[PDB]
Design a binder for this molecule. Sequence first.
Ligand SMILES: Nc1nc2c(ncn2[C@@H]2O[C@@H]3COP(=O)(O)O[C@H]3[C@H]2O)c(=O)[nH]1
Ligand SMILES: Nc1nc2c(ncn2[C@@H]2O[C@@H]3COP(=O)(O)O[C@H]3[C@H]2O)c(=O)[nH]1
Ligand SMILES: CC(C)Cn1c(=O)n(C)c(=O)c2nc[nH]c21
Ligand SMILES: CC(C)Cn1c(=O)n(C)c(=O)c2nc[nH]c21
Ligand SMILES: [Mg+2]
Ligand SMILES: [Mg+2]
Ligand SMILES: [Zn+2]
Ligand SMILES: [Zn+2]
Lengths: 824, 69, 69, 827
Amino acid sequence: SEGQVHRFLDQNPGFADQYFGRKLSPEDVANACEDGCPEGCTSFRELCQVEESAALFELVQDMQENVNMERVVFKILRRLCSILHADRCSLFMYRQRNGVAELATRLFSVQPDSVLEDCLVPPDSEIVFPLDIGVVGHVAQTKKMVNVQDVMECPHFSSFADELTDYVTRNILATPIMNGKDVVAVIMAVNKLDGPCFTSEDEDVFLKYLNFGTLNLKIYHLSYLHNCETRRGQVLLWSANKVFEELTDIERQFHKAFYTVRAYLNCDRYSVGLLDMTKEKEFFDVWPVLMGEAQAYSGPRTPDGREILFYKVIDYILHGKEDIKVIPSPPADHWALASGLPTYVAESGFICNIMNAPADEMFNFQEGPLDDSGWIVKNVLSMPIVNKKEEIVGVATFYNRKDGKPFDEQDEVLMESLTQFLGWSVLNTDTYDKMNKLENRKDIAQDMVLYHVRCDREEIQLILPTRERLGKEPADCEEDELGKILKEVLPGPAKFDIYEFHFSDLECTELELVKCGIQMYYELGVVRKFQIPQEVLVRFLFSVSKGYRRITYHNWRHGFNVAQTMFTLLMTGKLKSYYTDLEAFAMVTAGLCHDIDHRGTNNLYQMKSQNPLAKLHGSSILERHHLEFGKFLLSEETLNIYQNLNRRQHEHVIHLMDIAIIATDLALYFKKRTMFQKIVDESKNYEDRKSWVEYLSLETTRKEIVMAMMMTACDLSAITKPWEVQSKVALLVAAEFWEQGDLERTVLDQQPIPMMDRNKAAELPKLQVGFIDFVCTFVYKEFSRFHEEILPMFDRLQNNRKEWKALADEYEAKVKALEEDQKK
Amino acid sequence: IRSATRVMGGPVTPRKGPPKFKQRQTRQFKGFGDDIPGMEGLGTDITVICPWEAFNHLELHELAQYGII
Amino acid sequence: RSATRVMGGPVTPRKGPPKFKQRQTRQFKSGFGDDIPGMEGLGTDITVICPWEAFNHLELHELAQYGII
Amino acid sequence: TAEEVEKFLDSNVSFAKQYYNLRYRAKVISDLLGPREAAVDFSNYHALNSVEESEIIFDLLRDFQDNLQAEKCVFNVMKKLCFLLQADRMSLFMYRARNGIAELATRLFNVHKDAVLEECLVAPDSEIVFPLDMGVVGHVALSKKIVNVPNTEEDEHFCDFVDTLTEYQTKNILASPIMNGKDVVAIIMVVNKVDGPHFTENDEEILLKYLNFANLIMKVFHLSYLHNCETRRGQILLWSGSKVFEELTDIERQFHKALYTVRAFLNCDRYSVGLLDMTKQKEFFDVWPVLMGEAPPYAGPRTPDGREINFYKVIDYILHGKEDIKVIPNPPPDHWALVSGLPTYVAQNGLICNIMNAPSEDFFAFQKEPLDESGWMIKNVLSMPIVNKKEEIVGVATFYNRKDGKPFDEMDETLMESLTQFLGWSVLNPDTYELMNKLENRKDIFQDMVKYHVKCDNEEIQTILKTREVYGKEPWECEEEELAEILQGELPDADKYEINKFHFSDLPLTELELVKCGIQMYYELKVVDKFHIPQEALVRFMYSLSKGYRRITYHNWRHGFNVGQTMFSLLVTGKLKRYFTDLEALAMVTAAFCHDIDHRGTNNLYQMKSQNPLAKLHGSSILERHHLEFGKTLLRDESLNIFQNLNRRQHEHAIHMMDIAIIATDLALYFKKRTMFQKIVDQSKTYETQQEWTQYMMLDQTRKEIVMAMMMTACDLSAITKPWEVQSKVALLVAAEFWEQGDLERTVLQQNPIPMMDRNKADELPKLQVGFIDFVCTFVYKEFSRFHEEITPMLDGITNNRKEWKALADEYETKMKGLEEEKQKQQ
Ligand SMILES: Nc1nc2c(ncn2[C@@H]2O[C@@H]3COP(=O)(O)O[C@H]3[C@H]2O)c(=O)[nH]1
Ligand SMILES: Nc1nc2c(ncn2[C@@H]2O[C@@H]3COP(=O)(O)O[C@H]3[C@H]2O)c(=O)[nH]1
Ligand SMILES: CC(C)Cn1c(=O)n(C)c(=O)c2nc[nH]c21
Ligand SMILES: CC(C)Cn1c(=O)n(C)c(=O)c2nc[nH]c21
Ligand SMILES: [Mg+2]
Ligand SMILES: [Mg+2]
Ligand SMILES: [Zn+2]
Ligand SMILES: [Zn+2]
């Protein structure tokens, strides 16, 4: 009997090793095997070896083509089931969510004869298993192979699959597939038909035979991780590119960043909601609640203490046709807000992962078709968006991964990185708002400054009495009428002798100086050539006069004196030969506004006191401020005397003004001083004056150097005045210096220099003599040598030096005869 | 067909209770920037302007007396 | 000694006209962005108006007449 | 015995095989898959039968362990293929790409039938680098196919450089590429078939069949390398993003912070960063000497942007030994990183440079000696530029001596390119930092000029505080007593001018007299002595308030003084002070005096419609918040601070009261909170005596604030309760201002003004005035009359004014009616 043969074989180990360990004839092994084995095989061992080697080679060839994973592991599971004489095997795939581990199913009830259709499980049929329930959880958590002799005696065993699948288990054997120190999957064999329990040989075969499925799963896991990391890197790079494009508000930045990376997320829909950031309410909004007219707020509150209020929601529909929608005021029944998950996320600040949203109890869902397209929510993942101050500014929620699988650890890491990067970028929005507010404040301050400096309607009537003579406002007057009015009021060319080197303003009022300033412009002839409006000219002169502060020395009188000295240098000194009319226009205009807003202190005091002037401007603190203020006044339409000028002429005038105003700095004059000497020396040998005038009229750089030198000479012109005018101005500068020294002593608590203290007020003649010897003499001697018409300046300078020296010797004799004679 | 696991509709699990959620990632990536060595030299200065060019020491002293320095 | 019989350094049967790669400026590079859908109604758009919601259109029109609104 | 059993087994050999594979297959599978040193006769060359084929197949399968050392496994496969293919030597040429030009270096060389790993492994310094278009190796790289060369002489693309170098002769070649699916990963080769003319087709079949095992090993190696590189790139980018957004800082500190943290993810011994100077154009005094001929023009390298190449700061990161970080301002040309000349070349061209075997390079000048005592010597470098959003090079970053002793490859280039791309984008933050600093400084400068133009100087203060005449000292030297005597001498009498009455008129008085009356008002509240207010500061503050008001048709200093006088009269004559304290009353008056300090003559609607900067800044209540801000600015000045002798709590309470008062002047806000004041007034009538009501109100802050707002609103509109003579002129002033704003609206903008503003309808003023009286003022005045009996004069005055305005409007309407029927309709 066949059963008799089988039993006699199995209960007789002595004979079994003998007959099967026999040299079998080649034709016998040829007939025994199906089809025909090659000549190599001669025994059962060789036949089994050849067959198994061929099967393993075919399996390797299958893995070679691409990443199949499922098919290869199914075939090796069938082979292992045949080898082990079991009847069931399964594949449980490791997955991590919310920081906890799970063991889903990927292959179930694989039998020695089966097809991939009846063992593969769709994502909607997996039996998830926590890391505590069941033997599989123990295997996953202990990272060790587990053999169970009897299931009924196993403490950590779960029967959950038995009722569902209607099966009874009597033996279990499992092992974790590892990719280093992380579990990838577990493979389990159930209900050993071979015998009562798993023998040691079956354990050894199970351990050895699985070194190939481990390789396949390792390849699959490595490919998945590489793809995920590449996608995360691309997302971060694109977000960084979009964030740094410009400075905008939070909403624009968030929308750009979220829209640009819509292809790297692989999601059906995702919505972004923005939370209000109002910390406190105003008095007129808290009054009704405190008076019992309205009920106090009672609802969810963020951990910062604010009120959850989504004031804007942006939707991204991607499954069908792209439809980006922005909701101004999100209704309470919005398809995203109605779940209640974003509100809970805002209250807590937790990353929430949902596997089966319809079968949920904490948050309610629609549990049906959201839209006519029949898109049903199946997987949700929500994260907060916090800045560097740990304040939630929004909530991002993602739905329905495209591939049809629940959100795993990699997706959580990717989207958390995206939201983390977007949270830090809020610092750009704060800087944007702060910049806008600063700009608005500066513009307001500039307007308030402009109102006070400008000349109003009533003030202009002191110079343009059109309200009575014409009975009309100056704006509506005609050019001819304005000129006729101006002719009478304006002083005559020789009334105030504005052409001389000895002009004194001590006998004229401020209005007289303004009228003389207008008369200089009329004398230069630029009024009729450039079509300068006369009302604009008068208003500009009055505004410039008002711009100067009411300080001791650097008041409007100093500016007018410098302008008049430049005018007489151009006209009386015959330095106009080298310059055109536009250059003279710009020169006079720059001379008027060279000390427009002097505060009464020099540059060094600005540097030492950390004034904002010393911070905004680095090299020439005050001299750059005056130019900026003067150009600010000229930018106004009503005060722009450059209204009718070509673009090239305007740029030329602006460049000349920039050169002239900054040139008044004494340090720059000291540095670039020998170039003027070289130019003078070149002039002295060229030829008669006509050829030199012809040549120098074309050299731009030499003309600019002479321009700067004339600026410097005009700035210090107060010394080349007659001794009556001198010795009176010299007291004003001393008073200003003494005031600055007092400010230095009280505020900065530093001892002033011997020039800048009231105690050494008897050494003024010596200091004046030293200043004359050091600074003025070089420039005035060089200008006298250049043009012989400027000799009176040098003569008066030498006379003033003689007078100051005589005073110094008198003081020295007095102090000598006191100290070294009276005491001794 | 009845499927391998005999389960339809959605994933089943033998775990009941309130779900747990991850806290955040707010420690691994978190005076500003002062512990970095070599940090002292870096920083914009307010003395990047040349005081004066090649001048005699007596003239340099004289410039200070007149506040032009 | 060595299987490749060279110890000083790598050897190549070529010459020395060094060639270097150009920077990529096509993928990422080439207000700023307005073609994005939904960008029009997403700015600051400061138009905060008090709803009033307590004045009928008679008194509302009267209030608007005097310019207080 | 089982003789019948063995006969039965012979009868059905299938059953015997079944029994054997049930009870014995597991043992043979366990033994074969375990260490068994497969026995194949390798002594001679012979054909392989099924048993030996199975043995060699189970080998190369025993090696599929967890460690999976690629080199050892591929070496074993090659050693077996040597016997299988009947070849003499084999080698492995790895595939790498540098500078966009792919190379083919060697890793395994000269493996024969009986060889060992140490004698066939190739160190990184012994590689034979081959271009991709020189030999048959390059041909198989390009064609991506197996190539068989029966004779080397007939081959056109065969190179004998290795043959001469390795004193070897090759007559046969057969190679095949190992691919990851679309990109080659390595090339295997055979040479000099033993005991044969050339490699046959069977050798090709054997090589193709046994190449399967090496493909998986190459795949796992490549996948692991790529995954590691991508993870490193992601970490680098995220760390850099974290460190950039910490705060706003200049480029140097930001770059140092970004580059210090990612030092671990960059597998380099050294790397340094140099910073270029971005100055584009000099100034006139710097171009004068060059043009005049005092200094030779600059001659040297220039960036493609058109600037001089100057490195003003270089940061060195040394990591091979002890971690040192140094910064060298104005580095000399002798610097170790700059002496090579590669940074200057990169700055000139803006190209990514990858250099292998740097010492043996002729284009540049690299040091060929140990740079330090440890013997660290430059072998491989990589330098790339940093480019901002305007295609301007900002700096150059260089990297040296990869840690694993291998030349830089494509992945390193991509990683560092992503890092430098991120760094170049982040330059926006330092630019915004500098712009912010400049804007803040510019704002601070302009605000001082307003302070000077509004503050009362020492010359104007002598018009009231005549200290320079009664004494010889300036007000600073004088003590408080002398100032008090001078003030009491100068200040006008209170009852003579009727400063606490509801009919006070400012028409005869002058503005200086109004300032003196304001000082007298402050004195009359007994506030100066209580809080130790400096009298000089009080006078200067009042004069500054007088000067700060614009010379507008209506909103002059006179209007502010009228509002302040009305508030004082309400506090004193109206007996509304019983609730508030002295400090609250002081805040009342001070906020009343500065409610429209800087009015421009236009309402909030014009500010909103014309997009004024005030509308952009404040938004909700433009002019009221502007006035509050400007008024608080003046009080913050030391010379104009009357709150200086106040503790923190008192000062905070005063400031809060001021903000409550000033904003409350808004008409919409008053319109939205009338019913609450009505409810307070109604509640006031449920108490028996006034004393109880005063006691209750003194402890209710919100109702006091509501009364604050209502009294401010009543004082703002107080000009409509004056006798007929004053109203007849104030109405015309207000109408003129409104007409001016309307004609401004018609010109600058393009909307017709409302009938309340257009100049043509100048004869409908009585109708608008009576409508305004009926709409706004009557409610507040009637409520205040109900609240306190002493406010009735205001009610009777306003009702008389309404009667007169109604009479005028009726006369005008009758005139218009008559002029339109007898003259226009019926004729
Ligand atoms: N019907 C069926 N159940 C299985 C199979 N494999 C494992 N199980 C069962 O799934 C269960 C999961 O928890 P356990 O590991 O404790 O015990 C296991 C087994 O009882 C299989 O192949 N078919
Ligand atoms: N000595 C030796 N030379 C080889 C080996 N493999 C390839 N080569 C030689 O190196 C060369 C690489 O490109 P070739 O086309 O010149 O052909 C090859 C052969 O000439 C090897 O294993 N040993
Ligand atoms: C005050 C300073 C600009 C230089 N400066 C000057 O210009 N004048 C006219 C002086 O008399 C004078 N005395 C000292 N410094 C002087
Ligand atoms: C708008 C504001 C001037 C309020 N206001 C006012 O105070 N007075 C006195 C008026 O006559 C008037 N007429 C309109 N609005 C007016
Ligand atoms: Mg000056
Ligand atoms: Mg107002
Ligand atoms: Zn000057
Ligand atoms: Zn007002």
